[PDB]
Amino acid sequence: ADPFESYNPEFFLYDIFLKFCLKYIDGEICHDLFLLLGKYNILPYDTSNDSIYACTNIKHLDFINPFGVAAGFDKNGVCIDSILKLGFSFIEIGTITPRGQTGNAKPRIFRDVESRSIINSCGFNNMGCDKVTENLILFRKRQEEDKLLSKHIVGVSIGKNKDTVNIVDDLKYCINKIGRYADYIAINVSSPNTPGLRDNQEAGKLKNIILSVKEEIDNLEKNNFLWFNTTKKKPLVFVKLAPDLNQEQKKEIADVLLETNIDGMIISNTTTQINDIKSFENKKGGVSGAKLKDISTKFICEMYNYTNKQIPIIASGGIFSGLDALEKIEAGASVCQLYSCLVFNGMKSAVQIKRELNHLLYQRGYYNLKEAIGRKHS
Ligand SMILES: Cc1cc2nc3c(=O)[nH]c(=O)nc-3n(C[C@H](O)[C@H](O)[C@H](O)COP(=O)(O)O)c2cc1C
Ligand SMILES: Cc1nc2c(C#N)cccc2n1-c1ccc(C(=O)NC2CC2)s1
Ligand SMILES: O=C(O)c1cc(=O)[nH]c(=O)[nH]1
């Protein structure tokens, strides 16, 4: 790929445009501008074949490379194709809710370039389960005609509308509408921006949530070719956890995860523990990026040991480099999700991080990425 060709994600003009937008334009306007470029398929694309030695898996989920885009980036599944073609193996769309929501008062997204941090108080703004399902169906039909997207994975993050009293009613509604089209379902009980959502991480409540979601997915088969997704199998079930939990809570959750046989755990969502970023002093919400890296890596180590290495991990939190990715993997993660990396590193994010990790796996003496999983604990 030529360095001065516009189709190349590493093309210098992308970093110039991004640096300008990061300096002078409102955060959510930048994000919506990126989604618009994606929607009209004007984004650059990765033309390199991914290394077979950096492939990974979670059960039957075969990731072509270890990098995906975390939930909350393409909330409505409006440009799945364009984001994936930047060089990512998967994307988690959503978080979606049964009815659409505009979310919390704007401005609600703020970036701190020096510390590579983001604070947000979005509050699950999305078009609603029915409209997002239409968007995902359209992608599944495009994927069926395009061989280049046949191995890319799409997960769906599901949550509850703000006014819903019982979360399970909302999760069931989403499963019944979008479940048939998802490779995996991520249960979001960790947003800090929906009042009382995090209370669902209590052991007793979480167990009922997991068993009800699993029962609802299992009933799609019982009541009714059926799977219009990548795997051609029922979606796996993941739980996304908050890093703001005590040791007693983490241990109780781990015991529930082992008993309910969850397919994976996403570690982690944003934190409410970071109070040292000056430009975020009077801002509300959860913090993402570099200040979240150490907290979430420590949380991966803890959960990997609490679950006795039986539950696969999806890493989320401050991953910017090949070095950051390897640290997550040796801590116990099987795959990585990026968010803040796309915001601060731009279009080149996937191409660059994949190169850095392949080089690092070679320097460290690993034959493949699978050999590195949980190696800190070996
Ligand atoms: C503006 C914004 C919106 C987000 N929305 C969601 C969401 O809807 N669902 C979710 O599970 N996580 C959401 N997240 C959390 C990210 O998926 C991710 O876990 C977090 O940003 C930490 O990763 P990072 O340090 O690489 O950014 C959001 C993050 C940001 C910055
Ligand atoms: C990767 C990228 N590239 C661009 C370009 C370019 N080139 C122009 C405008 C926005 C761009 N982006 C962004 C995508 C998302 C961005 C962002 O700031 N998101 C909000 C949640 C924090 S900034
Ligand atoms: O929509 C949001 O506010 C949101 C959801 C989530 O899970 N995490 C986050 O930081 N923001």
The reply to whether ligand 2 has any atom less than 6 angstroms from the CB of 342 is yes
Task: In whole angstroms, give the CA distance from residue 220 to residue 12.
Answer: 48
Resolution of the coordinates in A?
A: 2.0
Domains of the chain: 1-378 (3.20.20.70)
Whether 292 lines ligand 1, by a CB cut-off of 6 Å, is: yes
Which helix H or strand E contains 56, and what residues bound it? strand 56-58
Angstrom distance (rounded) from CA 194 to CA 126:
13
Say if strands 90-96 and 67-69 run parallel, antiparallel, or are unpaired. Answer: parallel
Q: Which atom of ligand 1 is nearest to the CA of 340?
A: 27
| Nearest CA residue ID for atom 2, ligand 2 | 346
Nearest ligand to the CA of 11 is 2
Pairing state between β 286-289 and 117-120: antiparallel
Query: With a 6 A CB cut-off, is 289 part of the ligand 1 pocket?
Result: yes
Give the ligand with the smallest distance to the CA of 123. Answer: 3
The encoded tokens of residue 218 equal 């299992």
Cα–Cα distance list, 5 to 10, 15, 69, 138, 345 (Å): 9, 14, 24, 30, 18
Q: Is 193 among the annotated ligand-binding positions?
A: yes
Q: Which residues, 6 or more positions from 362, have their beta carbon under 8 angstroms from its beta carbon?
A: none
CA–centroid distance, 260 to ligand 2, in Å, is 39
Has 124 been labeled as part of a binding site? yes
Cβ of 159 closer than 6 Å to ligand 3, yes or no, is: no
DSSP letters along 244-287, please?
---HHHHHHHHHHHHHHT-SEEEE---BS-----GGGTT--SEE
CA of 215 to the centre of ligand 3 (A): 26
Residue having the nearest C-alpha atom to atom 7 of ligand 2: 14
Q: How far away, in angstroms, is 167 Cα from ligand 2 center?
A: 32
- Between CA 314 and CA 47 the distance in angstroms is 26
Residue 95 annotated as lining a ligand binding site: yes
Cα–Cα dist 81/142, whole Å: 9
Q: Give the list of residues 6+ apart from residue 367 with CB closer than 8 angstroms, or none.
A: 53
d(CA 129, CA 137): 12
Residue 319 alpha carbon, nearest atom of ligand 1: 26
- What is the Cα–Cα distance from 11 to 85, expressed in whole angstroms? 15
Going edge to edge, which strands form the sheet with 286-289?
109-112, 117-120, 286-289
Ligand 2 atom nearest to 15, measured from its CA: 7
Residue minimizing CA distance to atom 17 of ligand 2: 31
153 near 184, Cβ under 8 Å? yes
225 is in an annotated binding site: no
- Decide: 118 in ligand 2 pocket, CB within 6 A: yes
Question: Does the beta carbon of 120 lie inside 6 Å of ligand 3?
Answer: yes
| Catalytic residue annotation | 191
* Residue nearest atom 7 in ligand 1 by C-alpha distance: 72
Task: Pick the atom of ligand 3 nearest to 124's CA.
Answer: 1
